[PDB]
């Protein structure tokens, strides 16, 4: 497990914590064995989409700053995929991530902007920005997967007859193929559209710079599924679709 | 170009940014370009692009 930029953890903390805010407070933290085990759990869930689903470890003894849950709700929308032809999350977990992102989009600590809520109390049922731009799309819906990496982008396809006659499918993350510098995709572009409408230019630039690390990591994972895992024990195509 | 910049997410060929210093702006105002004579390759270019 490697950072996007190696050795950045050992530089001085005053350099790393540049300013104030939830993301600034979160940056500078270091993980321990529990979070390492949970991270490799997440990666195993990514490596096996059709068999592993995830949910939160919620206990009555929790007490921490809300920013960590806040960032988790912000980032799980890009990290996980839902809808389309396969899902990686429970309805409860998707709902929790969505309400966390609702909390983030309503969290305002530098600048006060206008807000236009909707008829219901549903998360993201409002319009934001100087131009009215709808955030209600990212509310979770497993029919198409608007809020995750299955949004209007192909993920499964077929090229040639496989040696194993029940595993014809090719599983590609973010629609890219191994056989790419600077390429983007629909979900990420619309996330940046949301963020520039929210006017959070700090994390807009942060994510804009962090794109290539995400893309190369997902390409590597894509390679791992489409190459190493091809065996007789892979799930049949009809059962994977159903 | 401008609506793409104000939307914040580019779909096609993006513009390019460059870095300048503070005193460069005053120098840019206090100096001015003046064309001596036209390019040597100006007249023959259509053959090249054709």
């Amino acid at each position: 497990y490697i950072a996007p930029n190696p050795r950045i953890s050992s530089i001085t903390l005053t350099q790393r914590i540049t300013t104030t805010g939830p993301f600034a407070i979160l940056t500078g933290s270091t993980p321990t064995a529990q979070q390492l085990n949970d991270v490799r759990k997440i990666y195993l869930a990514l490596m096996f989409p059709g068999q592993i689903i995830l949910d939160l470890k919620i206990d009555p003894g929790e007490r921490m700053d809300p920013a960590v849950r806040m960032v988790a709700g912000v980032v799980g929308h890009l990290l996980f995929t839902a809808g389309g032809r396969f899902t990686n999350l429970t309805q409860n977990m998707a709902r929790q991530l969505d309400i966390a992102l609702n909390d983030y989009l309503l969290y305002m600590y530098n600048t006060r902007v206008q807000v236009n809520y909707g008829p219901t109390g549903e998360p993201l049922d409002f319009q934001i920005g100087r131009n009215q731009y709808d955030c209600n799309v990212f509310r979770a819906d497993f029919a198409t997967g608007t809020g995750y990496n299955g949004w209007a982008t192909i993920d499964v396809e077929y090229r040639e007859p496989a040696p194993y006659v029940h595993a014809q499918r090719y599983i590609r993350y973010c629609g890219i193929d191994s056989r790419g510098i600077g390429m983007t995709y629909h979900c990420y572009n619309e996330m940046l559209r949301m963020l520039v409408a929210a006017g959070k230019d700090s994390e807009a630039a942060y994510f804009r710079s962090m794109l290539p690390f995400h893309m190369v990591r997902f390409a590597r994972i894509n390679q791992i599924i489409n190459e190493d895992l091809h065996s007789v024990f892979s799930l049949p195509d009809d059962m994977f679709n159903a | 170009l401008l609506p793409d910049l104000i939307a914040g997410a580019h779909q096609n060929a993006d513009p390019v940014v460059l870095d300048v210093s503070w005193i460069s702006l005053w120098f840019a105002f206090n100096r001015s370009f003046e064309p001596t004579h036209r390019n040597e390759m100006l007249e023959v270019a259509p053959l090249i692009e054709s």
């Binding site: 930029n5 510098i181 690390f213 | 390019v16 460059l18």
Partner: peptide, 28 residues
């Protein structure tokens, strides 16, 4: 001083490639 098209093209391309190498400094 003076300036011209070929030398200025080489110039601007050199700084563009410098910036792109700064981009790929993240490319391990």
């Amino acid at each position: 001083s003076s300036d011209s098209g070929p030398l200025l093209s080489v110039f601007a391309l050199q700084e563009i490639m410098q910036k792109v190498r700064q981009v790929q400094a993240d490319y391990m």
